[PDB]
mmCIF file of C-alpha atoms in Angstrom:
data_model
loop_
_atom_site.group_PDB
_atom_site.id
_atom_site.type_symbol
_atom_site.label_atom_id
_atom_site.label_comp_id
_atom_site.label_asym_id
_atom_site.label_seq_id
_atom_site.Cartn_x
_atom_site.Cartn_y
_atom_site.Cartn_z
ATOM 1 C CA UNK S 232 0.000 0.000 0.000
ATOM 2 C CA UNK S 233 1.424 3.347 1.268
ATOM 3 C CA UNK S 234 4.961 4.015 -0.734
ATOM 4 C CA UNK S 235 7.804 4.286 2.091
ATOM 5 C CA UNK S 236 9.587 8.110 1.215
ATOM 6 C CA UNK S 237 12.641 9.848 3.781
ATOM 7 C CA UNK S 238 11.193 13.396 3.640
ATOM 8 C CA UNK S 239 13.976 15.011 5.147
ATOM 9 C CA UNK S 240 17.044 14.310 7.687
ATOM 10 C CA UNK S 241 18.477 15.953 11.064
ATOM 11 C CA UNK S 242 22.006 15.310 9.641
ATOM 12 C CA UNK S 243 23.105 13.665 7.120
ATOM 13 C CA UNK S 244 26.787 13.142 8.573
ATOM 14 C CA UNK S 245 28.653 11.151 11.265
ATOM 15 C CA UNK S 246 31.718 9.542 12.763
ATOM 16 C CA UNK S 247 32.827 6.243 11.536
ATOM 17 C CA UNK S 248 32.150 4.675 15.209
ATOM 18 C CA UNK S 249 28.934 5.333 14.336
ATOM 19 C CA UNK S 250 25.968 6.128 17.248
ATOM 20 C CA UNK S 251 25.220 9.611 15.713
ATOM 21 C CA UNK S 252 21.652 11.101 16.924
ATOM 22 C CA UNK S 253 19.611 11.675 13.672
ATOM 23 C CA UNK S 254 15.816 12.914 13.411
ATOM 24 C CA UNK S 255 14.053 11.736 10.205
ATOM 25 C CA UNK S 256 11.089 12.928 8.821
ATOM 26 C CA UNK S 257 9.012 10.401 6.887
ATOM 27 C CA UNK S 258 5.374 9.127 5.438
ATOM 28 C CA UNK S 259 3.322 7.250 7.335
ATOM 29 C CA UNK S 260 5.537 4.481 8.957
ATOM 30 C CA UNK S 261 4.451 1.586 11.599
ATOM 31 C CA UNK S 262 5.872 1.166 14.710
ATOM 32 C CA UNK S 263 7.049 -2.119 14.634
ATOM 33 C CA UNK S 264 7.276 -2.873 10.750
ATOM 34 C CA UNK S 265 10.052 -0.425 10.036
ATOM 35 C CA UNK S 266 13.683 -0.090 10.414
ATOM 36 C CA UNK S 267 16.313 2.114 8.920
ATOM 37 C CA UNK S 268 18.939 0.498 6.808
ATOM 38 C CA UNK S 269 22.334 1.325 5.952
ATOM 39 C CA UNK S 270 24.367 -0.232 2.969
ATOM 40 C CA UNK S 271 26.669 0.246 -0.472
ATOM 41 C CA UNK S 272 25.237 -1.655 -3.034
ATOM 42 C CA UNK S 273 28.760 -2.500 -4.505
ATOM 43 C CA UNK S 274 30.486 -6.256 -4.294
ATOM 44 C CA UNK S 275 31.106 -6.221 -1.133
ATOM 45 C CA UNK S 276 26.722 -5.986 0.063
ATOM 46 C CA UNK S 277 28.024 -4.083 3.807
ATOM 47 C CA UNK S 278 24.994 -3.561 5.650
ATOM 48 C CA UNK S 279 24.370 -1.754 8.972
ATOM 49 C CA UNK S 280 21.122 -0.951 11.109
ATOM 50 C CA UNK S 281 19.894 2.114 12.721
ATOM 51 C CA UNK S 282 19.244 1.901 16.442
ATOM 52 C CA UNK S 283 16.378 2.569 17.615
ATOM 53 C CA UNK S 284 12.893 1.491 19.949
ATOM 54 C CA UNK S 285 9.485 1.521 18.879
ATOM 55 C CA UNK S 286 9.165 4.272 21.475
ATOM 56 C CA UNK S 287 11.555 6.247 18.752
ATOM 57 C CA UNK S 288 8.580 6.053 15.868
ATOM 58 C CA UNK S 289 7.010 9.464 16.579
ATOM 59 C CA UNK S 290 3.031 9.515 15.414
ATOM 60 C CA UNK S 291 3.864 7.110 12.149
ATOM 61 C CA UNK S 292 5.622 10.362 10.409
ATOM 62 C CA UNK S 293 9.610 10.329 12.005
ATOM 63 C CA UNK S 294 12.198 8.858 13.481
ATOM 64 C CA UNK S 295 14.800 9.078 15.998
ATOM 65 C CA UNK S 296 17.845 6.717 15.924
ATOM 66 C CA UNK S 297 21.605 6.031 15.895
ATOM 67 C CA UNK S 298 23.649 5.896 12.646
ATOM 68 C CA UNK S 299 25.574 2.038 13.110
ATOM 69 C CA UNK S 300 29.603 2.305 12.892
ATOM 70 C CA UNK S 301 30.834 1.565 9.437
ATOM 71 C CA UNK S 302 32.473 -1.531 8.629
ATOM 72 C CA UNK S 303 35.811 -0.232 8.412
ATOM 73 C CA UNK S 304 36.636 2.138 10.864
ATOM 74 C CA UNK S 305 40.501 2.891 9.834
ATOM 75 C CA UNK S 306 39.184 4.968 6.798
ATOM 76 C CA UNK S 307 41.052 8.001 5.460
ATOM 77 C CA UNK S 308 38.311 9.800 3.705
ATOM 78 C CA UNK S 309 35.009 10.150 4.069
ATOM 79 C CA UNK S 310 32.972 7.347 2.933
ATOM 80 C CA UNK S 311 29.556 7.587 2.173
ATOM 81 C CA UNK S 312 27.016 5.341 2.141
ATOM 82 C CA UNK S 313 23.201 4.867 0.954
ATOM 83 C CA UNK S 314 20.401 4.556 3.757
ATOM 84 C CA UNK S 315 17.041 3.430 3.460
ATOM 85 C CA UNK S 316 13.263 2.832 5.215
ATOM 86 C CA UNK S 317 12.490 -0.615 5.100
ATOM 87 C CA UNK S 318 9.686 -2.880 5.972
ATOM 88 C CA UNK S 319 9.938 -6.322 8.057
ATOM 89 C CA UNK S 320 6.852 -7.584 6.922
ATOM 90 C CA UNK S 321 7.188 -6.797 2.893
ATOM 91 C CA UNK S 322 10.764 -5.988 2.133
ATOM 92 C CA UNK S 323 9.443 -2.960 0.435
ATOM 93 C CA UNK S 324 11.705 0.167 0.436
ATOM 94 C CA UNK S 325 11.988 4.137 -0.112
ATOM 95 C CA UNK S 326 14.172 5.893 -2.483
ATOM 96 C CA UNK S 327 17.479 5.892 -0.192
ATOM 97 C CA UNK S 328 19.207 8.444 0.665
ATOM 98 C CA UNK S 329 23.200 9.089 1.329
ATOM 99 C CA UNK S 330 25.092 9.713 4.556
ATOM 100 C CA UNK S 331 28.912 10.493 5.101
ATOM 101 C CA UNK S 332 31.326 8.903 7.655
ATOM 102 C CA UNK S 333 34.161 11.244 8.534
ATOM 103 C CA UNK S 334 37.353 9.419 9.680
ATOM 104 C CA UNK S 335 37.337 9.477 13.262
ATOM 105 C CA UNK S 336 39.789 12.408 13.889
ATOM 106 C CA UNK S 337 42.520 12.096 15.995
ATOM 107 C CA UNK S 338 43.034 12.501 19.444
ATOM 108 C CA UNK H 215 -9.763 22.325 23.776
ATOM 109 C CA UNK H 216 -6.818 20.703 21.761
ATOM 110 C CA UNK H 217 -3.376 19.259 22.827
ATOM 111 C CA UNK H 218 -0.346 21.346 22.579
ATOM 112 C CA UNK H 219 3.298 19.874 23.917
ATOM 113 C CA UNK H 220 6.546 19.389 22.916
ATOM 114 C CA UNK H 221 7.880 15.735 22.847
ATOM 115 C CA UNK H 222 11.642 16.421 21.901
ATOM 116 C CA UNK H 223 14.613 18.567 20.464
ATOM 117 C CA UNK H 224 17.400 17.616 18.669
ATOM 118 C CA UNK H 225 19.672 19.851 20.434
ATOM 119 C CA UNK H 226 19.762 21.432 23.664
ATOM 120 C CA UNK H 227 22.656 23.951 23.730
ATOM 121 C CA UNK H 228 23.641 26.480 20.740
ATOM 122 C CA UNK H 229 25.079 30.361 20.238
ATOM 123 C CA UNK H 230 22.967 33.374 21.346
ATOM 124 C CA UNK H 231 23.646 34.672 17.244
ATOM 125 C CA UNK H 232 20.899 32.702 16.909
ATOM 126 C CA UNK H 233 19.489 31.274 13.277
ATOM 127 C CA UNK H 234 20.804 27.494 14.178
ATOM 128 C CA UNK H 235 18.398 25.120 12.882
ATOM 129 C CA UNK H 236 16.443 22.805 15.082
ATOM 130 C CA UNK H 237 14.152 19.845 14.798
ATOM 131 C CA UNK H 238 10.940 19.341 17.258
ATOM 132 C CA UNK H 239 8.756 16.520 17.175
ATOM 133 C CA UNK H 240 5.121 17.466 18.723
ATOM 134 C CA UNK H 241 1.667 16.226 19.034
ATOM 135 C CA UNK H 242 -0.546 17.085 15.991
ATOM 136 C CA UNK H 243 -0.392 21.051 15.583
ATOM 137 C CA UNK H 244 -1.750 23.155 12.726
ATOM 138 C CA UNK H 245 0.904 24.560 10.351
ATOM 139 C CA UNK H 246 -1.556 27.607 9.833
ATOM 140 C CA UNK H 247 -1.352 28.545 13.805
ATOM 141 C CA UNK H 248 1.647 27.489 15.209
ATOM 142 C CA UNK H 249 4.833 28.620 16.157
ATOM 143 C CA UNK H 250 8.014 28.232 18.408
ATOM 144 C CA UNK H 251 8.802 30.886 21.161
ATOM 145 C CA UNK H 252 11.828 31.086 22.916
ATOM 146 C CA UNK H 253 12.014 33.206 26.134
ATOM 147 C CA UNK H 254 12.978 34.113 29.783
ATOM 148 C CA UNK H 255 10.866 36.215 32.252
ATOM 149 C CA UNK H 256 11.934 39.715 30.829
ATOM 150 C CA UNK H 257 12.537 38.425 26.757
ATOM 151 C CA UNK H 258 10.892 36.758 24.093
ATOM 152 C CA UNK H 259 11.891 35.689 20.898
ATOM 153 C CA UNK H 260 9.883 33.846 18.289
ATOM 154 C CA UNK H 261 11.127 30.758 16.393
ATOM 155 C CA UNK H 262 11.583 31.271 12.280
ATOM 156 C CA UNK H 263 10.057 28.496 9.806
ATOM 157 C CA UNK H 264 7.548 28.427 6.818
ATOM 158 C CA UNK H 265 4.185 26.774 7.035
ATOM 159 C CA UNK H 266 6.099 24.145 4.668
ATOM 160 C CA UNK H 267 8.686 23.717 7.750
ATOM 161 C CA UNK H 268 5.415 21.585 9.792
ATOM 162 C CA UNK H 269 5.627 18.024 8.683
ATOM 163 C CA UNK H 270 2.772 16.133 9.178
ATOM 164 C CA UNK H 271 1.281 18.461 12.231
ATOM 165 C CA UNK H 272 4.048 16.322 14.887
ATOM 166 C CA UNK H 273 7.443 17.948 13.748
ATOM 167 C CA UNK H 274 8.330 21.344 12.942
ATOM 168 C CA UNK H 275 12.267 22.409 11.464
ATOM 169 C CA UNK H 276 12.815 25.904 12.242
ATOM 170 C CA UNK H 277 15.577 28.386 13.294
ATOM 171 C CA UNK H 278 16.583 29.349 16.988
ATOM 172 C CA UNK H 279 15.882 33.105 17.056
ATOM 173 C CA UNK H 280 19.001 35.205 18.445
ATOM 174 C CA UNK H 281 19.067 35.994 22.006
ATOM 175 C CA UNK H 282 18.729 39.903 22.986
ATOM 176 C CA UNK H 283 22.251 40.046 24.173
ATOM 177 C CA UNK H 284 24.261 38.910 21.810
ATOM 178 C CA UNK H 285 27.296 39.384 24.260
ATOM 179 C CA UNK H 286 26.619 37.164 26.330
ATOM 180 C CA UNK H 287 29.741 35.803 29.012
ATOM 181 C CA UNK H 288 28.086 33.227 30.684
ATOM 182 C CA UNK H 289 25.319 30.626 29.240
ATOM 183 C CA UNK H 290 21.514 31.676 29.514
ATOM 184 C CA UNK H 291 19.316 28.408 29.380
ATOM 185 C CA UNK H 292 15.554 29.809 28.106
ATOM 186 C CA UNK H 293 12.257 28.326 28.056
ATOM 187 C CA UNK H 294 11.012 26.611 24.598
ATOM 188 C CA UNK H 295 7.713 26.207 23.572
ATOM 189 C CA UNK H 296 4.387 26.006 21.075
ATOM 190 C CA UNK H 297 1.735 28.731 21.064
ATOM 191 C CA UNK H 298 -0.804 28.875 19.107
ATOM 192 C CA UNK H 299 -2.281 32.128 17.168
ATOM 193 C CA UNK H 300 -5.624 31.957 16.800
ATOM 194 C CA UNK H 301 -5.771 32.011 20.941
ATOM 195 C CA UNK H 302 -2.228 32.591 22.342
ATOM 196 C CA UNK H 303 -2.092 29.636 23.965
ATOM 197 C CA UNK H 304 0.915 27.964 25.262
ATOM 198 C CA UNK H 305 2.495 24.149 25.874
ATOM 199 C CA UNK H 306 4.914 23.463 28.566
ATOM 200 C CA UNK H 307 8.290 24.682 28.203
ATOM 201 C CA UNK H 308 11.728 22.500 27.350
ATOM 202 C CA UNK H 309 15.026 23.539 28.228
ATOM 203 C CA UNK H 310 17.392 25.531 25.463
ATOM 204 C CA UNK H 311 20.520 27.196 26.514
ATOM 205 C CA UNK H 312 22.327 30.110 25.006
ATOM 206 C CA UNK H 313 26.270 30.027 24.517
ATOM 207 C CA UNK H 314 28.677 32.717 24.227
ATOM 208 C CA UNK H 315 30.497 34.122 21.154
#
């Protein structure tokens, strides 16, 4: 039914370690049935998931969660990757969208 | 007779130059009588954002309006919250602090 679409995004940035706050504004969305998804469709298939409760699904229209660390987290430059609303039940999807790691400066 | 509150912000700290964008999720509001006000017991700033800024009446983007001294030395934390314009009416407040700079 309903066609899954990110309508806009807190930030669209993070560190590498991943566990970056983001805000996501959506269309109608359930609950339980949806969860964020990371990936680069390349060879490899990578694939990361953002963190976050049911509690975190604000009136079906947004999102609150935690970017997940990148695979590799001795990069040089930033990477960036594709993210995208998914359903449990269907497998359906939304156009994805992009978001950055920066290499975790040093220290 | 209708709801009005503030569930979250995505930030809780940011410069008294004000115009620092922000993202609120809310109970269902009207886009066409809403807005964010910002304020302490002697100011009172009002939130900027478009009509188009209100997604889905439970979230609202806009920008933190700059605080009246824009010298500040120390932090000022300031109340945050929704009133509506058709009757002036307010939600409870959420914690924002000014910094310096």
């Amino acid at each position: 039914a309903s066609n899954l679409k990110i309508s806009r995004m807190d930030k669209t940035a993070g560190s590498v370690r991943g566990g970056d706050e983001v805000y996501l504004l959506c269309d109608k969305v359930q609950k339980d049935d949806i969860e964020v998804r990371f990936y680069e469709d390349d060879e490899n298939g990578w694939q990361a998931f953002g963190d976050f409760s049911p509690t975190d699904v604000h009136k079906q229209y947004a999102i609150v969660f935690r970017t997940p660390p990148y695979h590799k987290m001795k990069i040089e430059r930033p990477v960036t990757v594709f993210l995208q609303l998914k359903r449990k039940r269907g497998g359906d999807v939304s156009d994805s969208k992009q978001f950055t790691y920066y290499p975790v400066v040093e220290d | 007779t209708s709801e009005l509150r503030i569930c979250r912000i995505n930030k809780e700290s940011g410069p008294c130059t004000g115009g620092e964008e922000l993202y609120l999720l809310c109970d269902k509001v009207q886009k066409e009588d809403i807005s964010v006000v910002f304020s302490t017991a002697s100011w009172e700033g009002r939130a900027d954002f478009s009509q188009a800024d209100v997604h889905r009446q439970i979230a609202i983007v806009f920008k933190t309006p700059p605080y009246e001294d824009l010298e500040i030395s120390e932090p000022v934390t300031v109340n945050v919250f929704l009133q509506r314009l058709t009757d002036g009416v307010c939600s409870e407040p959420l914690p924002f602090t000014y910094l310096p700079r």
